[PDB]
DNA sequence: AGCCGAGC
DNA sequence: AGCCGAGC
C-alpha cells in the first residue's frame, strides 16, 4: 500500500497470503498484459508489479546501493520480506503477504537474465525460501488466453541441492569471473562441435538457459577483429550503405530504418546511442568517425554526455566510409539471414584494421575488451611495409588531435600526459588534458578542490580562468611563488592530475572464424588482419576477372547483334518470340553472360539484347556501343595485370588522399 | 537571498544582493534554449544574468482559479527566483528593494508559438503587478553554440524592451488573454483576416504592448485557427493533411512504425512543429474504437487505445504501426490529385491546400478543434447515409435530414431540435434486484463511468448493493445489484437518468474554412453538405476534362508508336545507321508528332524519345499485336469517358467505395 | 567509486 | 471542474 505501480492482490496480507502469487513483469507494458489476462477473478489471488529491466545484483553490491535501490525496496515491501530473517519454519511464513513470486519476462535472453537476477536476489538474501518452492515463472486479449491455460505456461523452479547453489554463484558472483570464462569456453566449444556435426532446477536454468544470455552478451558486446564492429554497429553501417543517403538523416529516423532493414531485435533507443557513438569526432572518441555528426553529438567538455536528443540531430556516411569498406568487396562477404530476410554480413573486410583505429571497447560476461586508438596513417604505412615483405614497426596508441604524450611504461601499459607549462612565477597554463579526461570533470574534480580546499585537502591555487574552445582546453592558473615551487618539486603533471595510466591487458576479439581469442599485442591483431585482407584482395581479383569478362562477352554479343542488324545480316521484324530465340541460338549468340556468371557463383536469356532501345541502331549509338565494348576488353586486361597487392595499394592511396582532404577541411572549420 | 530549490535555474551571481536591480532573468523556451543562453553568456554573463527554462505554454493567470495558480510549479518558480510577492505594488524605488532581479528578458523561438509564450508572460506580469510594467520590467531577446556567443556579444542589437504607453496597452493585453473578451477576439481576428485578404488582392529598440499584441501575437492567434480548425472540403487540418499526403506519396504496402512515419511526414511535407504532436495526430487518425472515427483512414496496428480509457491507453508511438486503410484512396482518388493546388515550402512541393473527397469527410469523422476566438465541433455521421444523400442530390431530389451516427454504437441518438441531441446508453431490468448496462452514451469511457458513477453509487447514500464487469475491449457490460425497493425507486425515475446514461449533445459552433480559406459558421450539416456537393460536382467536371485531355494525348502517343512499328516492320521506314539529326528531321517530315503527353502537360526541338526508346522486342510479332491492342483500347477508353457525365463518374466512385466499405466492415466484425 | 557501451 | 486536440 502506497506503491503507485503495484496492483495488489485483494487477499494479499490476510489469511490467504501464502495462496497469493506476485507477478513481477519485465516492463510496465508486460504488467498491463498480465493485468488484462488475470481478468476480474484473478485479482483475488494474484498481484502484478512491473520491473524496470535489469535488477541490481545484490550479491557483492555495497550496503549503501542495496538499501537505496527503490525497485528492490518495493519488492520487499510488497512481499513483506525481512532482511536477515530465516524462513525455515512454517510459523515464520505467516510474515509474508505473498506465498509465491511469478517472474514474467520476454522469452528472449535478456528476459532470462532478469529471471536470474531475481533468482540471485532471493538466493542471496533468503536461501531458505527457495527450498519451499518460492519462485516460479510464466512462459509465453491474447493474454486472457494464456492465463486460462495457466498451468501449461507455469513452470516452477526447484532447488535440488548444492549444485543449484554453485550454479547461481557461478553466474552472479564477482569472485567467479574465471569460472565464467571456463563455463563459457566449454559452452562455445561444444556448439562448434554440434554445429559442424513442469519443474526446472536452478542448475538447469543456469546452465541450459541463462548461459544463452551470457553467450549472447559477448556476441553483442565484443567486437570482431576483422572489421572492428559489434553486430549492432555493423547493422548500422550495412543500413547506411544500402540507403546511400546523399543528405543528412535524423538519427531517430535512421535507427528505425536500421531495425526494419537489418532486423535489429532490441530497443531503438539503444541503436540511437550506438549511432551517436559512431558519429562522435571529439578528442578521445573516434580517430575516424564513419558517420558525420551533424548537430550536437557531444563534446570533450562533457565527454559526449552533452549530446542532444536523437530526434534533433542528423547524420550521414563520412566520405571515408566506402573508401575503407569498398563496395566491390561486398560481393565477397557472407550476408546473414534473419527469417528469410538477408541482413548485414558476418563481417566487413576493411582495407586497414579498423579495430585498431577507433579503439574497440566492450563488456561481456566472463570477458571484456579494451583497445585504445591507433593512428590511421601509421597503420597504412605498416600495411605497406608488410606488402613489401618487411616487418611492421611497433605502434604506440595515438589519438587524433591529442596534443599530449603517450609513453610506453611496459608491455600494454602507457602513461598518457596532458600539457602544463610555467608561464611566470605566479602562473601555470594547462593546454591539454589526458585522453578521456573531460574538461568539465577536470574543472569540478581537480581545479575547484585545488582552489577551495576540501575537508580532507588544503587549497593550492589562488585562482583559475577558462579560455577553452569547443575542441580545445586552456586553463590559466594562479599560485603563490611558494605553492608553485612545491608543485614543481613534486612535479607538475602529477600534482595537477594530468597523467593517467593506460593498461590494455584484455584485448579480446572474435577472430574471422567467430572464435573468441585474446591478443597479447596489437602486432598480432595487425598480422592476423593482414593475412585475411590479403587473401580477400585475391578473392576480389578473381571476382573482378569473372565479372568483367562476363560484361565483356555481354558487350561483344550486343555489338555483334547491332552490327549484323544495321548491315541486314539479321532481321527481327514481325518474327515470333520463339522463332527469334531459336534463330539467335543457331547463330551462336550467348545467353546473358552476366546473369549466367552471377548464377554460376552459387531457357536462353537474350533480353540483354532485345531490351536495347531502337536508338541502339542509330549511327552515334552504334559508335558509342563499339567504344564501350572495346573499353571493357581493355578494362579486363588492365585488371588482370594488377596483383592483389597493387589493388590494395590503389585503395590505400585513394583513402589517404581523402583522409588528408577531410582532416584538412576539419581544421579549417 | 538565495534559491536552493530550483535545479534548472542558473542564478546570476549578483542576484539577491545590492546589485539585484541591475540583474536580468532570462526565461527561455525550453531547456535546450537555456543551454544556448548559458553558452552565449559564457564566463562574463554569469554575474548579471540568470537563466531559467520555461516548459512551453505558461498558465494564463487571468481569471484562473486560485487553486490552479497556487499549485502551478512554473509560476511559483518564477516568483521565487525574482522575489515577487502577490498583492504588492511596486511604485516607489523603496518597493523594488525586495526583488532579486530588476528585469526579465524572454527568449523564445522567433515563431508564432514563441510569441504566444511572450504574451502569456506579459499577461502574467500585467495581471499581478501592473506597476512593474510601468518601470520597464519586461524585455525580449530576439534571434533570426558559436552563433550564441555572437548573439550575446551583440546583445544590444538583439535586445528589445517592452514599453507601456498607456491604457491602450491594457486593452490589448486584456483583449488577448481575458476569457470575457472572446467576442472581441472574433472581431479582432475578423478584421485581421479581412485586411490581409485585401492586401493579397494588391501589392526600433522599444515595442509597446499594444503593438506587440496587434502586430505580433495576432499572428499566433491566426495560425492557431489555421492549424486547429478543419477545412470544410476534406475535413482535415493541415497537419492531418500532411500525414495523408505523405502516406499517399510513400504508398506503403506494409506497416510502418508511427514514430518512423512521423519523421517521414516531417521531412516530406515540411511539417515545422514537434514530431510528438505529429505522432499523436497519427494515433488519432487511426483510432477505430466506438466514439472516435467512423472511417479511420490509417490502420491501427498495435495498441492505439480503447474505449475503456478513451484512447488514453494507446501504447508508445515507438511500439505501434500503421498504414493506409484500403478505403483511403477510394475516398480520395489518386486521379483527382491532378486537380489540387499543391503548396510550396521554400521551393519544396508539399501537401495541397485541400483534398477533394468523394463524400464530405468533414461530417464522417467528427471534425473538432479549438482555435483563438473560435472553436469547431461536429459529431460523426453515417457514411452510407451520406452516400445516399449525395446520390439523391445527383438525381435532383432533396437530401434527407441526417442525425449523428457513430459506428458500432448500440445506443440511441434523438433529435430534440436543431443541432440538439439526447444521446443514451442502454440499461435493462433483468430481474428484481438486477439491472444490466450494455451501452454507454457516445464518448463516455468505460473506466470513467465506473469511477464517477457506479463507484459513488456503491459507496458515497449508496444506491446499489454491488456491480460486476463483463466488458470486452470493444463492448460494455455492467451487471448491477440493488434492493427491490431501491430498484423500484430508481425505476420510478428514469433508469437512464438515475444511472447517468443520457448525455446531451449540442453543436452550435460548426466553424470551418470554406474552399477559399475563409472562416465560416455553418448553421446545419445540410448547409455543409450542399456547399461540399457543389464544389465536388464541379471537380468531377474538372476530372473529366483532365482525363479527356490526358487520355487523348496517350491515344495520340500510342497511334504514333503503333504507326512507327508498323512502318518499320513493313520496310516503309528504316533507322539503321542513320544519324540522330537525320532521323529527327526525317520523322518530322513524315508527320510523326513530338511527344503528345509531354506536349499536353507543358500546355497545362521535337521529342521522339517515346518512340525510339522502345525496345527491339517491339518489332517482334507478339509485341506488334500487343501494341495495336493497347492503341485501340486507349482510343475506346477516351471515347467511353467522353460520353459519360461528371455525375456518372461520381456514381462509379461511390459504388466502388461502398463495396469495399461493406467488405472491410464485415471483416472487422469477424475479427 | 566510477567509467566505458549495448542492453533491459 | 473537465473534455476535446494540435501545439509549447
Ligand atoms: C520507466 O519505464 C521503464 C524503464 C526501463 C529502463 C529504465 C529504468 C530506469 C531509468 C531509465 C530507464 C531507460 O533507460 C534510459 O533510456 C535512455 C534513452 O535515451 C538515451 C539517449 O539514454 C538512455 C539512458 O542511458 C537509459 O538509462 C529505459 C530505456 O529502455 C529501458 O529498458 C530502460 O531510470 C530509473 O530506472 C525499462 C522498462 O521496462 C523494460 C520500463 O517500463
Ligand atoms: C521537460 O522538458 C520540456 C517539456 C515541454 C512540454 C511539457 C511540459 C510539461 C510536461 C510534459 C511536457 C511534454 O508534453 C507531453 O508530450 C507527450 C509526448 O508523447 C505523447 C504521447 O503525449 C504527449 C503529452 O500529451 C504532452 O503533455 C513535452 C512534449 O513537447 C513539449 O513542448 C512539451 O509535464 C510537466 O510539464 C517543453 C519544453 O520546452 C519547449 C521542455 O524543455
Ligand atoms: Mg526483449
Ligand atoms: Mg563493478
Ligand atoms: Mg571507442
Ligand atoms: Mg518553435
Ligand atoms: Mg477553460
Ligand atoms: Mg474525430
Residue numbers in the entry:
A (entry chain A): 452 to 591, 638 to 694, 707 to 1111, 1135 to 1201
B (entry chain B): 449 to 592, 637 to 695, 706 to 962, 967 to 1110, 1135 to 1201
Text lifted from the article:
Type IIA topoisomerases (Top2s) are essential DNA-manipulating enzymes ubiquitous in eukaryotes and bacteria. The Top2-mediated DNA topological transformation requires the temporary creation of a DNA double-strand break (DSB) on one DNA segment (the G-segment), so that another duplex strand (the T-segment) can be transported through.
Because iodine is substantially more electron-rich than the 5-methyl group of thymine, the use of 5-iodouridine allowed the positions of thymine nucleotides to be unambiguously recognized in the difference electron density map. This expectation is validated by our observation that the difference peaks in the previously solved closed conformation of the Top2 cleavage complex are nicely overlaid with C5-methyl groups of the three thymidine residues. Crystallographic studies have revealed that these drugs interact with the closed conformation of the DNA-gate and inhibit the religation of cleaved G-segment by inserting into the DNA cleavage sites.
